[PDB]
Amino acid sequence: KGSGLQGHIIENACVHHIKRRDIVLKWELGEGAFGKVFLAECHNLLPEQDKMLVAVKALKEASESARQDFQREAELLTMLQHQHIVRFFGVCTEGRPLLMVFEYMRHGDLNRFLRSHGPDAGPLGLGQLLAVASQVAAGMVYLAGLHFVHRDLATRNCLVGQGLVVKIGDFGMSRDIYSTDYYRVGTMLPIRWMPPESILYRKFTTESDVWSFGVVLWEIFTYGKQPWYQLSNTEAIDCITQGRELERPRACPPEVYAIMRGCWQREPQQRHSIKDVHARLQALAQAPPVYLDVLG
Numbered sequence: 001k002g003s004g005l006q007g008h009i010i011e012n013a014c015v016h017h018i019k020r021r022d023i024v025l026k027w028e029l030g031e032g033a034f035g036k037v038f039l040a041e042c043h044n045l046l047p048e049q050d051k052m053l054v055a056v057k058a059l060k061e062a063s064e065s066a067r068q069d070f071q072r073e074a075e076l077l078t079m080l081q082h083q084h085i086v087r088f089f090g091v092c093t094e095g096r097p098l099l100m101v102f103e104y105m106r107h108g109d110l111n112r113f114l115r116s117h118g119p120d121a122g123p124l125g126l127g128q129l130l131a132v133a134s135q136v137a138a139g140m141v142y143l144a145g146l147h148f149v150h151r152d153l154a155t156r157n158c159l160v161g162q163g164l165v166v167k168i169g170d171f172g173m174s175r176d177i178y179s180t181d182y183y184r185v186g187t188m189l190p191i192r193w194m195p196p197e198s199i200l201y202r203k204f205t206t207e208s209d210v211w212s213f214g215v216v217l218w219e220i221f222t223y224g225k226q227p228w229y230q231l232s233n234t235e236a237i238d239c240i241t242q243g244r245e246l247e248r249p250r251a252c253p254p255e256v257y258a259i260m261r262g263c264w265q266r267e268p269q270q271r272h273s274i275k276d277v278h279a280r281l282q283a284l285a286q287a288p289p290v291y292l293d294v295l296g
Ligand SMILES: CC(C)(O)CNC(=O)c1cc(NC(=O)c2cc(-c3ccccn3)c(Cl)cc2Cl)n(-c2ccccc2)n1
Pocket: 001, 002, 003, 004, 005, 006, 057, 073, 077, 080, 085, 086, 087, 088, 100, 102, 149, 150, 151, 152, 168, 169, 170, 171, 172, 173, 175
């Protein structure tokens, strides 16, 4: 198992328990090899809300090892509390399937949102793209502050709620729903988002997270296009290990492309810290550069 949650547990809460009958399953949001994700109504969870919408992750396996891993993940999810981290509400361990309850983010994953609010399928403007980038960076600042390495930072692993609120978080099904974004070697790795040291040594750090954040900026400013989309997985590995960089997207002002390039320094020690990246994006989101994508 290679989730960022398990990776943090290995390197390092009173979990709230929700009664099964308080959860009313409404629709299936997705499914993977591990189980299913549902849209549900949850009673007795938030004070002024009787039928609040939640997203419910259901685990197919209920063995002793999966049950102990589930408990440790739930203790860690309970501890993660930030305005730009998806809210975790608790568990239901009344037999099979084990359930994890999260807030429901009505606009779905950020990749799906960017593609549905993009030009080739109105379009999000420069100020909205900068606000999305700044919120993702805020969530990454919080995780770096806890020495938490994400390991799979990408727009598919961010969620969008009402009022353009963007949060980091996923229901653990990206390797199934977005299998095209991963490549097997031995273990499914998101190679298009990884720096050279992670593809070569399979080592993930706060520095490889900053590189992936640079790739997130590129996804944002292309409205959700796949990095290196013209190339196969093996050709993408060669580009990255040879030191080739993604081209500046047309909607991307040179000022944001300079931030992307600072994330993509070949030497991990030469990359910008996420705190510096966040401060630069926050400044641009409050005062957008006068850039007209039509004029290049
Ligand atoms: C083959 C496998 C096992 O490898 C596939 N399983 C996975 O690939 C994978 C990746 C993740 N998600 C995380 O580990 C992860 C989750 C969050 C977060 C925080 C708050 C709310 C929601 N989500 C945040 Cl902020 C950062 C990370 Cl890095 N899985 C996951 C997700 C939710 C619960 C349990 C596991 N499973």
